[PDB]
Design an enzyme around this catalytic site. Sequence first.
Site, PDB file in Angstrom:
ATOM      1  N   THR H   1      -4.592  30.706   9.923  1.00  0.00           N
ATOM      2  CA  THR H   1      -3.379  31.266  10.583  1.00  0.00           C
ATOM      3  C   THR H   1      -2.183  31.224   9.641  1.00  0.00           C
ATOM      4  OG1 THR H   1      -1.899  31.105  12.504  1.00  0.00           O
ATOM      5  CG2 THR H   1      -2.734  29.037  11.580  1.00  0.00           C
ATOM      6  N   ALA H  49      -3.121  28.144  20.059  1.00  0.00           N
ATOM      7  CA  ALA H  49      -2.851  29.475  20.589  1.00  0.00           C
ATOM      8  C   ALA H  49      -2.463  29.417  22.060  1.00  0.00           C
ATOM      9  CB  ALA H  49      -4.072  30.374  20.395  1.00  0.00           C
TER      10      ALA H  49
END
Lengths: 251, 239, 234, 241, 213, 238, 273, 200, 103
Positions: H1, H49
């Site tokens: 990420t 997330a």
Amino acid sequence: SRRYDSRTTIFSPEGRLYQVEYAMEAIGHAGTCLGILANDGVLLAAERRNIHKLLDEVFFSEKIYKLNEDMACSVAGITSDANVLTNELRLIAQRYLLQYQEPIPCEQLVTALCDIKQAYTQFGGKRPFGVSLLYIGWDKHYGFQLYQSDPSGNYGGWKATCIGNNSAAAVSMLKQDYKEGEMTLKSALALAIKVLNKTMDVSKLSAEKVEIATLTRENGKTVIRVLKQKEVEQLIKKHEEEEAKAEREKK
Amino acid sequence: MFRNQYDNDVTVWSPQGRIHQIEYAMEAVKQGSATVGLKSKTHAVLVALKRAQSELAAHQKKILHVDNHIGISIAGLTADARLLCNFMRQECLDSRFVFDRPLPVSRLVSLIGSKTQIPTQRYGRRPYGVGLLIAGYDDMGPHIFQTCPSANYFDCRAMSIGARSQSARTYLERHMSEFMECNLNELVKHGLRALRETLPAEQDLTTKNVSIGIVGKDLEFTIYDDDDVSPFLEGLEER
Amino acid sequence: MAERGYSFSLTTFSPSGKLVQIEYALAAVAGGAPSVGIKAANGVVLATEKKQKSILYDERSVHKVEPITKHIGLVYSGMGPDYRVLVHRARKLAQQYYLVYQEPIPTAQLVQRVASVMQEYTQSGGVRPFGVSLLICGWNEGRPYLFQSDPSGAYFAWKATAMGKNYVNGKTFLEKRYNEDLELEDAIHTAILTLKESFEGQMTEDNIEVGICNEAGFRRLTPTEVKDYLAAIA
Amino acid sequence: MFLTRSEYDRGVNTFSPEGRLFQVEYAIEAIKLGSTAIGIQTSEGVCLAVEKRITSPLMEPSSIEKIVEIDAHIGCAMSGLIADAKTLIDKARVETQNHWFTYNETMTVESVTQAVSNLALQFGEEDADPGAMSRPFGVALLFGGVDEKGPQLFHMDPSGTFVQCDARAIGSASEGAQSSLQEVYHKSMTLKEAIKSSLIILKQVMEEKLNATNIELATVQPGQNFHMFTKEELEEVIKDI
Amino acid sequence: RFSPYVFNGGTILAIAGEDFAIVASDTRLSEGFSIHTRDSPKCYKLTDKTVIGCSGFHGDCLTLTKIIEARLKMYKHSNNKAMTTGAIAAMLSTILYSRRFFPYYVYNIIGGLDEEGKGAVYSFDPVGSYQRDSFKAGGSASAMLQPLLDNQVGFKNMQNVEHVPLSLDRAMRLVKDVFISAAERDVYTGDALRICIVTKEGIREETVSLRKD
Amino acid sequence: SYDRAITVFSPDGHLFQVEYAQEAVKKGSTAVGVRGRDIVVLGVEKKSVAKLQDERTVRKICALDDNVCMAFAGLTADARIVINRARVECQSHRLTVEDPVTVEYITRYIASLKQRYTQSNGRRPFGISALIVGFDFDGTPRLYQTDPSGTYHAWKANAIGRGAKSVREFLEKNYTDEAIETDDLTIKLVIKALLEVVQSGGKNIELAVMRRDQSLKILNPEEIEKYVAEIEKEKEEN
Amino acid sequence: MAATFFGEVVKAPCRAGTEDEEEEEETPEDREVRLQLARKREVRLLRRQTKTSLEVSLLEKYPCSKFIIAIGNNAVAFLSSFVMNSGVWEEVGCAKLWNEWCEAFCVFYHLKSNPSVFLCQCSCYVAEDQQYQWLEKVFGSCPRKNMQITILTCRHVTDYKTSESTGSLPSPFLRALKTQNFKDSACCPLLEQPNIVHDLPAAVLSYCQVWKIPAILYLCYTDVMKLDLITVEAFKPILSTRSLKGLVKNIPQSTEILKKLMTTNEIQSNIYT
Amino acid sequence: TTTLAFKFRHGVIVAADSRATAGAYIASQTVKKVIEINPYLLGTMAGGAADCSFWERLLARQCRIYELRNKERISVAAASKLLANMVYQYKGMGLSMGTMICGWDKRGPGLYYVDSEGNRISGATFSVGSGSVYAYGVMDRGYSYDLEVEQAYDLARRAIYQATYRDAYSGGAVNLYHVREDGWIRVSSDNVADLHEKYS
Amino acid sequence: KNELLPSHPLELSEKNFQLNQDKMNFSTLRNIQGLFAPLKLQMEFKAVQQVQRLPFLSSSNLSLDVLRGNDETIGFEDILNDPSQSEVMGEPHLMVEYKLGLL
């Protein structure tokens, strides 16, 4: 009225809280309490009221109450409500000292107690505190101060005010005989003696009908001491001598 | 005359031994619109006479969903009605979550009885001024239960509550045997005839003011309004 | 000025500014059995009359004069059950003070706490003021103490006072009799005489209850001692 | 034979001999004390029109807000007690945002009105320790918004009942405005015609001259979201009618 | 000590299409090294246009399915309409994140038609995060199933290929083959394959036998 | 009866206790506040110049925050409580949002507090009307007025307390854009309004001035007397 | 009867309303506002046609021979549906009043063919202190003792007192109360002994009895009150007998249709559906 | 990420990858890591997330409530402070939240970095994520305030591409966003493979 | 918040000592006496606690102590920390509103 004066929370058609006014009347029923502000210091002169021969005075202050090292107060109203209010005043002052490690300003303590009284007057089911308090204290911001509290919850800074019996006459006399800026501690004591002598019409003061406490600053320390009976007797004698001299001069 | 002091509160017993607030709640439910609830051997039908505040305003709904097999007919206070409907919906959801089976109608009515009894005994609370006709299907078959503002409940084969419901009750009592053994359409027509008997002679049933709720063996509770109640109205006999 | 609605309620102030229910509680106190307390130089005596309706009354069952701690005692005029509840509260407060400070509670502090309880009960609306006034005695720092806690919560330190029925006459008698340097075992006699003034009939060992407090501590006089004192004074 | 001063008007939880709850009816009277608000439901959108009661010219006309935005697609016109209206509006906005958060979709006008009604019936029946609505709300609301079903107009009453209305008027002149609406309203009217009719009825029912300063108008359309008419558009409409 | 979670196996898979939304899963309920039962479909139908698959801890799966059914009933009662697939997905995400510090050990995949009649597949994690995809596989054999779905449905790594729209029969054949491979190589998969096809006409249930352990 | 309980609605629909709180507000001393271009000024008419009293402890104009001011008319204790609560809320907002408090936000908070106290019959309403005035984040002058009921309205110029109607008529008659443009013009307008309120004026005038990006400051009696002399000279010229 | 808090002292209300007087028993402001309220509540009898305030009483200005008075929405609806269409009735005078409790109007009609016959459709409420003022305004001080007064009004079944419960009672039932001079058949059962009437019909009937005026009071007890058709149906016996036999012509058909018009345009109760 | 955010003259450029990995296995390759709070405000997704999505949605609804009540759009600083408070009240509960609040308010372009730890800091260039180091290097070497919109787009794309190239957990596509006074716009979503073909 | 997790295993028990003791007494009464005794004692406690000082002022709760049987029993609770010497007192109106349930 016979209405709007039951729950302590009904507004009258004109917008009046009659219960607060009745509490103020109860204050008026109380004994005379007097306080004068002077440049040298501020003092409280209060009528002891109870003068029964068999009554004993084991406390140093019959109605004067020391709140902290820098403050003192006097009471004119219900005795038990006054006791609880004085306990709360001491508690608030010590809480402020603990939090900030500095003496509480007089206005802050007066505001806290007035907030308590206003809260009692705001919520129904609670009898308003029928006590009027006169505060004397010294702080680093405004120096010597004199404050007056009311059952309603409104305070005010005064230079010379009286609460209790014959309050209006005492206030008028103070207005007549107060010199803003030139008032000293000795002249303040003389004025207080004169006002007490006039207001209490029973007889001449004998130093057992009154109680005088003076607040001063010595060596950077606030000194709160209650004038001894002998000193009050001397002040009364001086006032009587002045009155006799004035009468003789008048002819 | 002498009952003014015992009339104000619900926790005050009158000298005759009757709480007048419960009677006034009964009057309040009587003041509401009329509903008719009847059941055959296989179906339970609730027909209600919806009322509109004005010509422009839409007719206020009186048949409310409770579960896949339970429905109610509104009569009386609307706020208490909604509170009761929410309570019953929650009870049915709890039953189907715990036991994974439909809640029996009788148990729900008993719960409603206790819930509406609680206020009548305590101070500062008023009786629920709402009457409900509860139609449901259980293992025992169709059920019609009448809930009064007084916590006591009734088990009925047919009943009408509301304003001018006496004529509907008379009609229902006239044809109870026919109600027991008849087709679903016949039962709906009987309910419509009773509701019409409630209405004045000049007035007549229209698709706008008629709401029908039907629950049966293989049929879940479905509410019919306007075009959905039109088929039932068609074929109805003239007054 | 009927002021009936003002009198009915406790939290409602009268137009003049008087709490009528407090005056009614004070009247209840004045209607109670007389009790006399005298603060002598050697000590303080609490003498009261326990009017027994019939001879079938166990004197040891109840006591008008009760000890609070090893050095504090009190007597009352008014309602008995209120006095018992206040006695329990005073004992609890004294023991709390001893636990916190490991020192016998001064009489003044106990009087202040009891007065605070009384004020709390008379402030909130929903209850009634304690229809009883306590004459609390003690001995702290080598000095006798005598206090009177009123129903309103106002406490006063007395040298000699009487409550209950004919309390004004008792106070006048004490004024005539009480002396500045009067000592114990004579203030007992003065209290007995005051009760005689306030008593209707003959006073026996069981008709009155006397409790004294001195340097040793508070002690309720036994009936024999009361009998000898009564014989000595008559 | 002797009359009695039997009173059933003071207690909110007290039933009259006929079963009427008089406190709710007095809340309705408080509604009657409010200004007139007119809402019209058409096929091209909704039209909410209310009159601003400006006591003095110094008071800012924009400060007297009586048509607000619940959500982008929902508007509400109030009539009665202003603060009660504010509380109900806050509840409606919070409910709409909670619905969007939970279900990622716009809340139906019916659902918003139902939630506000559920809030507006807790007088002596909330059974909650927190201070609830001791007295019934003294404001009536007109939740006019457009949803997937099309334009919608719901009227909320102090009692707590919400009924869908094609055209509703609430306020001091509610009965006269309602009569005029029923005389002029037809199903196939356009949004502009509805606006003109509402403006004409308002001008009829107020004692003040109609101007952009003392009136508030808003419309919600299937295409455009809640839109508050500006002073220029208001003046244009007044000129047209 | 006490372990609130155990892995009961199970593999779920959803494929989205133009007018269909296939939701397939196995019927193997196995805890530890034993098989609890050979008949336990992991796909539960919520509405006419939505089917949800739950894999992982069986108790959490059952509780979550019951909560979802109750919430669907509540939504129908309140809004007077059946909840939409996207609305169900959002509600499930909120529910899953509600028990964040005691997470549900459930792998959730929602498959059904949207308001436009198109297949919509929503993939969830135990915490609650979700997104819309065209195809997804969950459970024990998710890693085994996903690459072939990417290769065939997604046409990934396929140079010079025709992106033919996914037909229903092709999707069914692909599902059957992927689950056959999973049964071949995954010990938690086998017995039977419950296929729920969500189309505008309704939901069709198909059972295909897989090789037993 | 209907007029004794706050929660009970009158048959006409009035909550007469709120109206009685409004009457109590009217019993208070007159407070006047106008709005000008980058200048907001407040003025309170002292009921009496009580000798032997510190004017600092009985002030009617206070600063809720560095950019918001407030003046009240009614019960002093209720005003003090409301002022303390408003200051606490202003600091809480500056904490949670980090942005300076808008006049609208604090006015809404005060109105909500007053409405909450009007809710239950156990609690009596606050018998005060407050004139909250100040500058927003962008510096736009803002003047607001709250009532015991809980309704707040923005005003170009308002007067509350005893004789409020006459002072409001005066302000409406003598409010012009030119007066707002000049800060001295707005100050003179407030002086004229308060002198209309009380004939004696002079020492009885309690005026406070707040300008753009400047904290609240109260003019000493010297400046108030100077402005009074200016008004008197202007009147003499005519 | 407040009970706002725990220890609140509540007082039992007196059915004789003594407590109101006891509190009542000055300041010039209080007197001024009291007089303002008194003049706000007083009945002002005037006519909207030509805006001529009617200082002179209606009876003094026009001699009357038959005064039919309807109080309540249902009674005025019945009169509007039955008597108006039979002939012609133009408005002459209209009392305007303001009360704490509240199409509220009091409009008077008179027949063009026979001006002696008058009418009154009092759709508004009149407070206990204003019925006498209304009587003074309309009838004046000097009566005629030659008028057939038929007072029509509607009440609730709960008001009626009898051994039978309210529900068991037939809801659409009506009773009658006539003065000594009124010797005509009541055509309805007389009111039960314990049942009392305490509104404008009672004021009019008492005035007629005291001044020897032949009058009859009809009370239609009903469970519903908001523009109900059954109520006017139960009223029809009133026109079936004399007095109102000639005022209404032999056209029930139009009246029946007209009565449907009034009921159709009615406002339902939002609280109770 | 890897997430990329920098404020240049013409606004704020926000870029991120679209790879979500559950351990070594790549859970998804199309996750949208740029959470759109408002039409004028938007945030990113780094770390947990689910936590980021839930808390950003809560912030979005709170901002909508603020706009409805105050009738004015919430400033970037206020929104960032609210998010910081919400995530701080749950401190020590294992939340793994990393985001950048990008928006335009009366002050101008706004960029605040907020994480679950509690610290909230404004700055010109920011980057949070596993591959944030590589994007930091590329952006710092290529960043300039006086940059054209196309140049800023290319810089963000290259930074994200390099971060994906060097980081195993970063990949997919570059979700490039641009914040302007009239509101944010979605510029492009370029596949990492296409970018590799282009640059190389 | 982490404040929910007790810092000491004995802390949670001793913080609700009075509540737990009342609960145990009610349970014993229900087991032996029946439903009437716990309900009666709950009503008595509610009535006694309803009348007292406002939150910002320390109350005596004498009737409550008498009903609970603690009028002649002293524990560490009564001595170690004095509610009168709070050392922390909030705004009077704030505390009253908090008790009333508004806050």
